[PDB]
Amino acid sequence: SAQKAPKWYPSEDVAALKKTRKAARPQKLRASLVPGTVLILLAGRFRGKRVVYLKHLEDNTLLISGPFKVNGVPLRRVNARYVIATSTKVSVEGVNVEKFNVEYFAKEEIKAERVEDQKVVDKALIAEIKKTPLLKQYLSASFSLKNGDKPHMLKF
Amino acid sequence: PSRFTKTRKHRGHVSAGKGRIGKHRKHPGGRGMAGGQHHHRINMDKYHPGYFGKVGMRYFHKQQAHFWKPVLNLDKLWTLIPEDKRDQYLKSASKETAPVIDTLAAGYGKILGKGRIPNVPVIVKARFVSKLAEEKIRAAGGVVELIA
Amino acid sequence: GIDHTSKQHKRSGHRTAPKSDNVYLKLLVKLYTFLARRTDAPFNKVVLKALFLSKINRPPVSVSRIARALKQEGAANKTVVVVGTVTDDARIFEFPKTTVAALRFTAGARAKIVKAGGECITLDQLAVRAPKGQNTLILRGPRNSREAVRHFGMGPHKGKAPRILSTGRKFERARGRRRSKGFKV
Amino acid sequence: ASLPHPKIVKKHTKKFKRHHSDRYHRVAENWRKQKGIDSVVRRRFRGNISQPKIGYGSNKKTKFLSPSGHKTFLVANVKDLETLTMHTKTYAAEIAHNISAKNRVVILARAKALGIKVTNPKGRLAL
RNA sequence: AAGCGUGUUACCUAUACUCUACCGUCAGGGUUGAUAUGAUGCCCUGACGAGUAGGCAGGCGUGGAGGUCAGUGACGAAGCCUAGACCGUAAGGUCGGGUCGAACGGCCUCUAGUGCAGAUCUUGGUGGUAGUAGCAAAUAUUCAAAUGAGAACUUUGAAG
RNA sequence: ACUAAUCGAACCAUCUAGUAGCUGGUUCCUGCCGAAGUUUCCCUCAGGAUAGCAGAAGCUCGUAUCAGUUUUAUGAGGUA
RNA sequence: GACGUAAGUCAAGGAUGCUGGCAUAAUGGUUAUAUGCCGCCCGUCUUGAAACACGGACCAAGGAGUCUAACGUCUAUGCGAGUGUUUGGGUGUAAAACCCAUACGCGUAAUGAAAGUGAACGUAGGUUGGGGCCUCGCAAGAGGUGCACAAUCGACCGAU
RNA sequence: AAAUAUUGGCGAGAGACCGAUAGCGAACAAGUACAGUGAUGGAAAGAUGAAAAGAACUUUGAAAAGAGAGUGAAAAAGUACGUGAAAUUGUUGAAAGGGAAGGGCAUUUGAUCAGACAGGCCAGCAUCAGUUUUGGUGGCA
Numbered sequence A: 001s002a003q004k005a006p007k008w009y010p011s012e013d014v015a016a017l018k019k020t021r022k023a024a025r026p027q028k029l030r031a032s033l034v035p036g037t038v039l040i041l042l043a044g045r046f047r048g049k050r051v052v053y054l055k056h057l058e059d060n061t062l063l064i065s066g067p068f069k070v071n072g073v074p075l076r077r078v079n080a081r082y083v084i085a086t087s088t089k090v091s092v093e094g095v096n097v098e099k100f101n102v103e104y105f106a107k108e109e110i111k112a113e114r115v116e117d118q119k120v121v122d123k124a125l126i127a128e129i130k131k132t133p134l135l136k137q138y139l140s141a142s143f144s145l146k147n148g149d150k151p152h153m154l155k156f
Numbered sequence B: 001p002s003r004f005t006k007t008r009k010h011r012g013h014v015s016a017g018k019g020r021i022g023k024h025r026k027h028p029g030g031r032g033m034a035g036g037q038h039h040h041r042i043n044m045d046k047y048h049p050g051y052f053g054k055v056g057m058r059y060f061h062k063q064q065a066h067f068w069k070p071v072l073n074l075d076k077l078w079t080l081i082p083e084d085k086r087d088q089y090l091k092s093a094s095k096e097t098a099p100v101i102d103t104l105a106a107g108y109g110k111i112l113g114k115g116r117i118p119n120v121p122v123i124v125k126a127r128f129v130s131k132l133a134e135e136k137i138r139a140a141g142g143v144v145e146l147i148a
Numbered sequence C: 001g002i003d004h005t006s007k008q009h010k011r012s013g014h015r016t017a018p019k020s021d022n023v024y025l026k027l028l029v030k031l032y033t034f035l036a037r038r039t040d041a042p043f044n045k046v047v048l049k050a051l052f053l054s055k056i057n058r059p060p061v062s063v064s065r066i067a068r069a070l071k072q073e074g075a076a077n078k079t080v081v082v083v084g085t086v087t088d089d090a091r092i093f094e095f096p097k098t099t100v101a102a103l104r105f106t107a108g109a110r111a112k113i114v115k116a117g118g119e120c121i122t123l124d125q126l127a128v129r130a131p132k133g134q135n136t137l138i139l140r141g142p143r144n145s146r147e148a149v150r151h152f153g154m155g156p157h158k159g160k161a162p163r164i165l166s167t168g169r170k171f172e173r174a175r176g177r178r179r180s181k182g183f184k185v
Numbered sequence D: 001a002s003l004p005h006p007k008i009v010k011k012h013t014k015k016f017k018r019h020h021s022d023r024y025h026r027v028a029e030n031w032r033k034q035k036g037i038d039s040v041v042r043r044r045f046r047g048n049i050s051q052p053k054i055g056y057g058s059n060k061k062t063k064f065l066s067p068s069g070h071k072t073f074l075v076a077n078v079k080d081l082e083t084l085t086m087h088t089k090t091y092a093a094e095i096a097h098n099i100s101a102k103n104r105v106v107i108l109a110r111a112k113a114l115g116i117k118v119t120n121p122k123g124r125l126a127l
Numbered sequence E: 001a002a003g004c005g006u007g008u009u010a011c012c013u014a015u016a017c018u019c020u021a022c023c024g025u026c027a028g029g030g031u032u033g034a035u036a037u038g039a040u041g042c043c044c045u046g047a048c049g050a051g052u053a054g055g056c057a058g059g060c061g062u063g064g065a066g067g068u069c070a071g072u073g074a075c076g077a078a079g080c081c082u083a084g085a086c087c088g089u090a091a092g093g094u095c096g097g098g099u100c101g102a103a104c105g106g107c108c109u110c111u112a113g114u115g116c117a118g119a120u121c122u123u124g125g126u127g128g129u130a131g132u133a134g135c136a137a138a139u140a141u142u143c144a145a146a147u148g149a150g151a152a153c154u155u156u157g158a159a160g
Numbered sequence F: 001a002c003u004a005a006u007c008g009a010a011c012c013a014u015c016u017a018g019u020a021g022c023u024g025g026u027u028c029c030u031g032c033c034g035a036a037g038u039u040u041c042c043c044u045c046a047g048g049a050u051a052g053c054a055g056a057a058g059c060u061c062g063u064a065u066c067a068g069u070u071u072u073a074u075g076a077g078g079u080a
Numbered sequence G: 001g002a003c004g005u006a007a008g009u010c011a012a013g014g015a016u017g018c019u020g021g022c023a024u025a026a027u028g029g030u031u032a033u034a035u036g037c038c039g040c041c042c043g044u045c046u047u048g049a050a051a052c053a054c055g056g057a058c059c060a061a062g063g064a065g066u067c068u069a070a071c072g073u074c075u076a077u078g079c080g081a082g083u084g085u086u087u088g089g090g091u092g093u094a095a096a097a098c099c100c101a102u103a104c105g106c107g108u109a110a111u112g113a114a115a116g117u118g119a120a121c122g123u124a125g126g127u128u129g130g131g132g133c134c135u136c137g138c139a140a141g142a143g144g145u146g147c148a149c150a151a152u153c154g155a156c157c158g159a160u
Numbered sequence H: 001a002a003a004u005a006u007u008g009g010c011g012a013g014a015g016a017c018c019g020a021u022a023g024c025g026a027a028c029a030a031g032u033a034c035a036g037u038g039a040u041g042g043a044a045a046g047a048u049g050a051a052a053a054g055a056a057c058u059u060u061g062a063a064a065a066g067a068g069a070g071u072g073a074a075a076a077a078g079u080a081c082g083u084g085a086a087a088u089u090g091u092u093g094a095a096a097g098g099g100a101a102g103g104g105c106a107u108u109u110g111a112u113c114a115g116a117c118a119g120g121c122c123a124g125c126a127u128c129a130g131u132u133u134u135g136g137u138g139g140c141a
């Protein structure tokens, strides 16, 4: 014997978990997040791009189609804590966002479904963006901070 | 044994438990009973009173076998009868058949009176007795027969 | 920082176990630890503590000391309990018929108790027949009749025994112990 | 797979080297408490080495555990190895240093059959 | 005033205070008709943690001894080296690699000539200084030849 | 002064590991506790004994007896 | 505990749910270096040491509370008014183990210088407490008995 | 006479003794070498390999020797011989360096390294629990 023995060994039995009191409850957003509000994306592939807030998905992610024909941003999700909510809104009571959910954006060349979904949703967006002037150029231009822009004093 | 001693624990510690100030030396107060009347007097008077001085008569050529006289007490007197046959005498506590206890062969020179023997008469053969030891033997109906 | 009123980390100063490595005494401690915890009988807690005691802390109990405790009124039928050794005493000539429970009996003590009509049992037979120690009688032997105690507290005017090897005249019966030689203690 | 265990906290991954074990070669790095009357290390002055003390003791739920989560048991032959047949998750085997190369093949094959983790399954392998 | 006096707030930061975790110590407890078979165990609860001289406790290591592991080993024991790895708060333990060649460990106990940084310690070995200080008294050497691997220094001749 | 580099008593061996209240040193870890330099005596003043401080072992009991505190009542004191 | 009529739910005696990347030197460890801040040389005597106090140029090996006679406290063990086989004898697988008679030591008696004498008036005393036990009480408590121990007054033994 | 003594002599048997700075001063040509007029003082020093098989032969060099070759399980065993530590040193490689160096906490950089797919590594978000910090605002005295 190179080492003697443990006279008794610790049990191989695995303990079950104590029943935990953490119910899952729905997330309340900050009040500045209302559907149709224009948002800036602060990170991602589309850093700084200005998008329209369309739907609030069940997995606590915002649904945005800042129109693809306007600035190249497709139908995709973003985290709520990673966007800037702007004071200016655009009416979204003509867009059908019901079929878009977590399963529409589940993982497992673009789909023929996804190219046609984008055109349907932004047709009611692009047409109603034209109601008030300069938005189409506003959303087509990315946001940035200049030599003196202080976000703690800036308004959005 | 060595491995259980404080010397093994004191390894690594400089003074080995003897102190840095006192600095263990050879004989800081003297040797043996030095200074029993001068600088160890308090210890000798507190713990060994009577040590210094003279007491009574000398005794040239003392032989302790002159003064050999072991004492047996009455409450231990019946132990000199053997264990088995002792009970026979305790019943029928009467004269004309009384146990002869010869305390000299049992190794005793004087019989003392620490007392309360049973009421059985008994014949005690002793070199010496005390007045009270004899009295309780005769109060039980026995006799002290002096021997030499 | 805490203004400590008492010494911190102080041990209780009482034995929680016997220092003995007797495997059989450890079973008696194991049984009375269970008994003193699952019963509210004060006897089981007293016996458990006495089973930790050192050899001088359980002096021998004579059968004569046992028999004198049976002259108390109503104590005759009680079971004498001695957490220690019961010795024999030849100075006592009559012994009653009683049940005695002890850690140890000498051969003379066991002979005398049985010959009287009595019974000698161990502390686990006592536990079975008296689980709460009902009708028991705990006896302890004299602690301070030890010869070592004679020398405890030696000093002037205290009348204690000096620590001495050879006794007799010429051994500490002089100056310090009589007025004719200096002073008396 | 070891039994599930918490995160492993060491509280001091750095060896407690002896004071001046890098100043004099004659002073080995084996830890020795300073007994000096003036020692800044003993007196715990700021800027000096820390001293081993009971506050650094490992969590009892996690002490003696290797980073994989097993306790190491030193084995010398096949018979020492089936001591861990029922304890494969809580213990792993380590072949002793003096075991021959031809006997290491036997223990490694037997451990792989019983599903026993070996902490050194590469000793004396001519590869 | 970044000075002096005085007042107001805001702010900075101790191993101190609060809360939590982990370690240890102490104290109080729970736990046997399966204690889900280790009761010097497992677990609950609370508090506490500075330290010379010194005391006690629990451990780590070394030489040898009784027992045991039908323990390891010429398919490589012991030793040594190793900014390679792992465990322990630590004393230390274990593994890989290289070198090596014949014995040596784990555990339970026994025993001691049992653990080093000091003692102007003992014995041995080695440095920096350092290619340094120096190899300067006794007037003095020189040329050629020979020998020789090699001549300021040997031999011979000549001269001084 | 000199008496073999030795002289106000040579050198060699042994008694002899002479004694030293004096100087130096006194070898692993961690844990818990934790001082004194003051009392009396001593050919004592660089030292001891003694009491005190400290540790350990505990023992008898189980909230007592208490208390580096105050109040109330009652004394005492001869300093500012 | 809260809500809900209930069912059940909950933020109520300690983190769950969802998603992404990587699956290796990315995190981490070790080590070298750099940077911020900090860090005087250890040991010793000392009121006080980094000291312009002492020892230490370096390294290896050796290197200092041991053993014995007698003894105090405490602890463990065996037996117990006894106890101690080992001076010896017997026996032996032979310095071991096993077995044993008489003595002897200590204890079971003290005191006095000694000659000597030598320990129950009593339930081996009385009083105050005293753990435990007994009786009665649901319990609190009350009464009885009260070992050890503590205080005190007595009795007995020796000296005077 | 015997029972008793025996650190000398002779012959034996042993050891929880020491293991080459130990154990006798002396494991060895040890009371030797050496020192002192003398009395006296008095060391250091064991180990190639199983066997010498102790390196034939070639080559460079005046030679010592080197480089090969060879013996050998091994020349990382070559009589400067088992292993072969440290101090100290040479070469190579890496790194840093304005009046020392060394160290403690943390991280960057370089180099190096262990483990794991039947969840390992690093994260993001939501709703809670515990401890805090910073605001907005409401109702009362």
Ligand SMILES: [Mg+2]
Residues within 6 Å of the ligand: B015, B019, B020, B023
């Ligand atoms: Mg000293």
Ligand SMILES: [Mg+2]
Residues within 6 Å of the ligand: B038
């Ligand atoms: Mg005087």
Ligand SMILES: [Mg+2]
Residues within 6 Å of the ligand: D012, D013, D014, D015
């Ligand atoms: Mg570590």
Ligand SMILES: [Mg+2]
Residues within 6 Å of the ligand: D018, D027, D028, D029, D030, D031, D032
């Ligand atoms: Mg060291």
Ligand SMILES: [Mg+2]
Residues within 6 Å of the ligand: D037, D038
């Ligand atoms: Mg100091």
Ligand SMILES: [Mg+2]
Residues within 6 Å of the ligand: none
């Ligand atoms: Mg001011």
Ligand SMILES: [Mg+2]
Residues within 6 Å of the ligand: none
């Ligand atoms: Mg501490």
Ligand SMILES: [Mg+2]
Residues within 6 Å of the ligand: none
């Ligand atoms: Mg200390």
Ligand SMILES: [Mg+2]
Residues within 6 Å of the ligand: E063, E064
């Ligand atoms: Mg050993």
Ligand SMILES: [Mg+2]
Residues within 6 Å of the ligand: none
């Ligand atoms: Mg090896």
Ligand SMILES: [Mg+2]
Residues within 6 Å of the ligand: none
């Ligand atoms: Mg190194």
Ligand SMILES: [Mg+2]
Residues within 6 Å of the ligand: none
């Ligand atoms: Mg060999």
Ligand SMILES: [Mg+2]
Residues within 6 Å of the ligand: E113
């Ligand atoms: Mg030694």
Ligand SMILES: [Mg+2]
Residues within 6 Å of the ligand: D026
């Ligand atoms: Mg050294």
Ligand SMILES: [Mg+2]
Residues within 6 Å of the ligand: B014, E118
């Ligand atoms: Mg030292």
Ligand SMILES: [Mg+2]
Residues within 6 Å of the ligand: none
């Ligand atoms: Mg020196």
